[PDB]
Every structure is written in structure tokens, then in C-alpha cells.
Design a binder for this molecule. Structure first.
Ligand SMILES: [Zn+2]
Ligand SMILES: [Zn+2]
Ligand SMILES: [Zn+2]
Ligand SMILES: [Zn+2]
Ligand SMILES: [Zn+2]
Ligand SMILES: [Zn+2]
Ligand SMILES: [Zn+2]
Ligand SMILES: [Zn+2]
Ligand SMILES: [Zn+2]
Ligand SMILES: [Zn+2]
Ligand SMILES: [Zn+2]
Ligand SMILES: [Zn+2]
Lengths: 51, 46, 51, 47
DNA sequence: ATGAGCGAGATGGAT
DNA sequence: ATCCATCTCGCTCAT
């Protein structure tokens, strides 16, 4: 299985209220968390709580 | 089959020659249509 | 009035291409200007020169 | 002068106060426009 | 009159 | 720093 694709959202100045919570974030889009990512001001709600 | 109303109500070059004309869109002529200043390139069949 | 604008007309996959840069939504055509410096595709702007 | 239709999908703080409003972009007021929730600061002079 | 569909522009993750 | 796929949202025009 390919390595978990890390994101870099919000690094640059963009709208900080949606960083990693829209379809441009590959993690958010794939229902993953940003564990291990290099995003800044991450607003990803996903926890990978697969239970 | 459609009878369009293009040009009745501006880009005069595209009248019945763009996706919003139901006849152009469907590869049809404007035979029987109510269009004004029709530019449909598909002529009524002789 | 500012220096003439730059457009990006025609980048979408539209088949409505007869009037690319030759209708009111092109800021160049609308202002009686050429597409000098633009990144439009399939440009039909009839203006060869600015102003 | 143009007649814009801004405000008639989201973000109303900036309607007619951003580069996509032909009036704001050209330093014109929205007097006579069809815009709605207009935030254009430019005011039309007195005739 | 009017609103669906259009399409040029803004955005910002990736580079 | 720009680039371009994706999204926004002002504009046109058949209805
Ligand atoms: Zn992200
Ligand atoms: Zn991430
Ligand atoms: Zn994140
Ligand atoms: Zn027609
Ligand atoms: Zn027709
Ligand atoms: Zn016709
Ligand atoms: Zn153009
Ligand atoms: Zn141009
Ligand atoms: Zn052009
Ligand atoms: Zn406006
Ligand atoms: Zn206005
Ligand atoms: Zn306004």
C-alpha cells in the first residue's frame, strides 16, 4: 500500500478557516486525518476513528 | 423538432450558433423556429 | 483607466468557441483592446492593436 | 457606466468591494446597479 | 421580466 | 515565486 500522502495546506496567506476542510486537501477528501502532515492551522475534523 | 426563440429578446454572431439554442445543440436546422437574426449554420434541408 | 487587462478566455472545455475574446465577457474585447500579454486559448479577438 | 448584478452566492462582506465588481474595479459607485447587499464605498457625485 | 447555465476570474496545494 | 484544477459568482439571453 502506498505511503499516506502528506499535505501542505495553509503553509503560504489563504483563508485559515477552511485549511484542510475542503476538497483541495487530499487528507480531508480521502477521510484521513492530518497525522504526519505539514499543514499549518489545520482544521481537518477527521480522526480516523474506525471502530 | 424544437422551435427556438433565439434573438427575440448582445452577441449577434452566436444567435442559434451556441449551446443555448436547442436546435444548434441538437444538430438541427431552424426550420419552423421563431428565431430572429438566426445564424444556424445547418441549413433547412432542400 | 488602468493599463489594459489580461484575460484567460477559452481555458474551459466549452464548445462555445465562436466568440472567444470577441464578446462582452472578455475584458480586452470589451475595452477595445488586443489580447496583448493574455493567456487565452483559441482567441478570436479581432483587435490587432490596443486602445 | 456599468450596471453590476453582484450579490444576487456567498461572502456578502465584499460584494461590490472586490475585483469582480466592474464598478468597484473602475472606482465607480453602484448608483443604478442591480446589485444587492452592496458594500461599494465609492459614492456618486452630485449632478 | 428571470433564473439556469455559462464561463472568466479567484484560489491555493503543489512545485 | 508561478501554475492550473477546482471552485466561485457576475453576466447573458432563451424562455
Ligand atoms: Zn490539508
Ligand atoms: Zn493532511
Ligand atoms: Zn491538515
Ligand atoms: Zn435558436
Ligand atoms: Zn431553431
Ligand atoms: Zn435559428
Ligand atoms: Zn479574452
Ligand atoms: Zn485578452
Ligand atoms: Zn484573447
Ligand atoms: Zn458590483
Ligand atoms: Zn455596481
Ligand atoms: Zn454594488
Amino acid at each position: 500500500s502506498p505511503p499516506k500522502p502528506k499535505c501542505r495546506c495553509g503553509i503560504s496567506s489563504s483563508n485559515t478557516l477552511t485549511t484542510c476542510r475542503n476538497s483541495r486537501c487530499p487528507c480531508y477528501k480521502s477521510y484521513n486525518s492530518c497525522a504526519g502532515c505539514h499543514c499549518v492551522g489545520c482544521k481537518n475534523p477527521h480522526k480516523e476513528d474506525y471502530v
